């Protein structure tokens, strides 16, 4: 009956006034002062009005909402002391094993659960081996993603967040068959009106996130890597079709070789394969009905590779707009492909991040990069990603060579989380 | 020595400058002001000014240029009388019979060379064949297309025109082969710095025309057909993506299935065929390197079928806006797409017409298939469009009955062409 909440981000916040309204847990938060601005003035300002606070924006979420306290916010991870029966994982996959790995032998001895948030593909073989070492029969859950969109609405005030939307619909595994964890979870899912779908292990579930197969090829391709690295002479966009975004043939190909790549994969661990054009069109943004044939969306798997292509492209035009949003009298809708690129940029340190987009889908890759050279899966695709992000990496370091740059400009990283998925394979 | 200029828009006063500045002949011109307010409006503005004048926007064009008399104006083509070496028409394919065929008996049997200035797929055959009963050697002579844009600015002044740009390339095509007048025009053609390639035949020339295989498939369909013959809730588009426009992939079938069955008829008559987007990027409109691959482009007509409905929708997606445009400080380029459908309107007699989109397509349609028929050549998708753009106009009866309705929406027109076509088929 104690749960230790790693992050103080909105994920963590929903997470926990979730946990507050609708469990009988004693809720600890665990931050990082130590590495980040974010989290301490978060600390700082929940030190100064002992609440948290959800709102929301469509009424139909209500029972997210939520003024809350916690039974105590921890400044850093080091801090973290005690027995807990729970952790649940609210921060990035990239730092799951970094962050348990500071925690105190006493308190990792105790935990029987941990669930990831936003795990990516592996993230479970990695944290179910690591905690092995410390209790024999650690129970770990996956969800495909965080259950909907949170943001801070004043950076000023980021204990006071906002949750502006929520998905149609999740997965979930663990690596215990139909516990009762499991249960709570989807009797808590059928409370907050979230469809969940319960899935034959953690690994199934964190395939089940498009962004797995989307960002890597949005991403990781000479004409994003400028935008972030370097910037642009006018302002570009991750959605939009050259020369005002990358989405290209060769960007759509590259996403069905990484698709493809992928379900090599998921056969090797006999995971079902994903339909990522149905994926993307019944549950991520519909289409009209016009744009797509039902037929063809069934049956892409199936389809020649050429018409896959073709139908992904088709895609990504049919949401250059929203075309359920209301026209003007102009017959104009609303510009649904304009999301700028995060370009690198200083923190208060002055010190240079690479933003999370594609930070982030680097770790990813390499862990799947990782993955395949253990199952001798070659992934020629995911290889050159990741060659073109180190490339864009060194280009920086020899370019700034004047700025403090922060450890994602490093190599190797990731050697603990790819030992740990080396081990948890030849285990099994 | 004599040359009749039939017609006396935009189109007739450019190529009446041409003759005035660069051939020996006396130039005649034939309006029809029995039947026309806006050929009246010529007369009248001829009549007092007693010049023509074209303009040129672009300096490139100045051997376009000039101010000019002719020495016979007509006002209607019943009034044509004498003896006329040269025949040009620079009217509208449609009514090439019907105004050939109210020339006099004397007039007709002294043409040696008709030149075809717009002609559709099959109008050499028809003007030869009608041509025929007169002059036994008739030279029939016909280009791709007209050599540019010309416009008037102000239609209060309609002698006063603009040619506001020229063609890359036109193709020529000439009953005789090597003729006086195909060199004669050849010699013109490198004096207006107008690139001119000579084909083998008119038919073959008349297949050099973009509009051909594009202009069915974008204005025979249902959203397209709706919008002109109905109107929309909010301005629609002619070359975005649904639901701004009709371009869907279902379109882009269409436009493949009219091009191949195109394709069919031109061996029939061993024309050589048309590599439709290769036409489209390399003579119509560029792309950005990034956009489509040169191989794809050079050996599109070999790709397979769903290939090139990809590189097609592609084609088009890449031209929602100029790519080439200068952007702006948000990055947005200027808005090539937004082209508003023009709709069925009302003449100053109260008459209700339906605009060249899709009127023009409709007879360019209709000859095919007709032809298509006479060789055994199933035309599936274009009877379709016949067949949609008939229920428009049996539907626009129906539902108009108070209004007056020009003859473009009576049945079967062109029963004299097709009779002209089934005749000269009969002979060869």
Known sequence: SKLLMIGTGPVAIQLANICYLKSDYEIDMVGRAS?????????????????????IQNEAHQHLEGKFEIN???????????????????????????????????????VKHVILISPTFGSQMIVEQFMSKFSQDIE??????????????????????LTTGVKKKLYMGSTHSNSTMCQRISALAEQLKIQLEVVESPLHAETRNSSLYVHPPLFMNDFSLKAIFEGTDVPVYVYKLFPEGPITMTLIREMRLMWKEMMAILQAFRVPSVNL?????????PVRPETLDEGDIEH???????????????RYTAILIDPFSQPDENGHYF??????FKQVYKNEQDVVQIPRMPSEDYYRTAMIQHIGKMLGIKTPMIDQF?????????????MHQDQQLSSQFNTNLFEGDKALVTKFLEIN
Chains 1, 2 share one sequence.
């Open 35 to 55: 590495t980040s601005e974010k989290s301490k003035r978060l600390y700082q300002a929940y030190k100064k009005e002992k609440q948290f606070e959800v709102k």
């Open 335 to 340: 510009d649904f492909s304009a999301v700028p």
């Open 300 to 314: 892409f798997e199936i389809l020649p590779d050429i018409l896959q292509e073709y139908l992904l492209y088709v």
């Open 277 to 285: 054009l149905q994926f993307m069109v019944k549950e991520n943004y």
């Open 72 to 110: 105590r916010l921890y400044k850093d991870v080091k801090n973290v002391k005690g027995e807990y029966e729970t952790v649940v994982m609210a921060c990035t996959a990239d730092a799951y094993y970094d962050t348990l790995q500071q925690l105190s032998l006493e308190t990792l001895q105790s």
């Open 140 to 161: 770990v859950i996956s969800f495909s993603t965080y259950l909907g969109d949170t943001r801070i609405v004043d950076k000023e005030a980021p204990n006071h967040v």
């Open 386 to 398: 990741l060659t073109r992000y180190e490339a864009s990496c060194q280009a920086y370091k020899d």
